[PDB]
Design a binder for this molecule. Structure first.
Ligand SMILES: CCCCCCC1=C(c2ccccc2)[C@]2(CN(C)c3ccccc3)CC[C@H](NS(N)(=O)=O)[C@@H]2C1
Lengths: 11, 235
């Protein structure tokens, strides 16, 4: 899940 | 109040602002659409929960204990409890702001039940009425916010997730939050020896209602009826 990882890694 | 419950209440989001942003997003992407392009009521609800999932992720992202797990452990916990948090948030919203014969959406809009019921269908109405029955008991038990955030962390830090590199903390928070809730319902609610047990027993029911909601939404997606909400529904 690239979108979920992005929501947890973005600033 | 136990100091652990106090720490959980701090990570709670700004609900008036969360509801304001979701309402503004939908008022934008709906009045923006063409006359022959408007969203259905079922489509509007899918975008509401999709936006709600964003604030759910951001809530856990900065919540205590959760912000210490590596991203891989964070994704596994959220992918297991995302639909349960949606149902738990919906149920608690009807406990606080709810009126009889009305459904209160995440945007702060009040909808009458019989209107939504005409379009929800056979399965959703049974899933909605089952959730509304849980709202009725939680109301009769005086379900407050301190017990709401502990149930959130009990659902988030579920024992039903694995491939966790730090299951010690997930197991540690589960036992620790459970002990704080048992102490809270005992100290702040004598009279109700049945409250603590009744509170935990809604979790398998919320888990069942949410997992049955996933299997129906996945059924709707394969039929072409439904994007963060969709990517969480896979795997
Ligand atoms: C046409 C009628 C559509 C349904 C209207 C009632 C709603 C729900 C519900 C609540 C309890 C029991 C069954 C349904 C939600 C259903 N979904 C989108 C969902 C998706 C995946 C997993 C779990 C739930 C869950 C919460 C959300 N409410 S919302 N629009 O405020 O954000 C939705 C609106």
């Amino acid at each position: 899940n690239a979108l979920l990882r992005y929501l947890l890694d973005k600033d | 109040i136990p100091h652990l419950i106090l720490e959980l209440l701090k990570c709670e989001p700004d609900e008036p602002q969360v509801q304001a942003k979701i309402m503004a997003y939908l008022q934008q992407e709906q009045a923006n659409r063409s006359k022959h392009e408007k969203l259905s009521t079922f489509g509007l609800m899918c975008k509401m929960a999709d936006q709600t999932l964003f604030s759910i992720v951001e809530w856990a992202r900065s919540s205590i204990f959760f912000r210490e797990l590596k991203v891989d452990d964070q994704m596994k916990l959220l992918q297991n409890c995302w639909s349960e948090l949606l149902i738990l948030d919906h149920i608690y919203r009807q406990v606080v702001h709810g009126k009889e014969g009305s459904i209160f959406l995440v945007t702060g809009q009040q909808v009458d039940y019989s209107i939504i019921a005409s379009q929800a269908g056979a399965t959703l109405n049974n899933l909605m009425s089952h959730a509304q029955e849980l709202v009725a008991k939680l109301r009769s038990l005086q379900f407050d916010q301190r017990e709401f955030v502990c149930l959130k962390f009990l659902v988030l830090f579920s024992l039903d997730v694995k491939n966790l590199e730090n299951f010690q903390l997930v197991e540690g928070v589960q036992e620790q939050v459970n002990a704080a809730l048992l102490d809270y319902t005992m100290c702040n609610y004598p009279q109700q020896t049945e409250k603590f047990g009744q509170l935990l027993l809604r979790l398998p029911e919320i888990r069942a209602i949410s997992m049955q909601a996933e299997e129906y939404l996945y059924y709707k997606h394969l039929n072409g009826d439904v994007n963060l909400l969709i990517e969480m529904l896979h795997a």
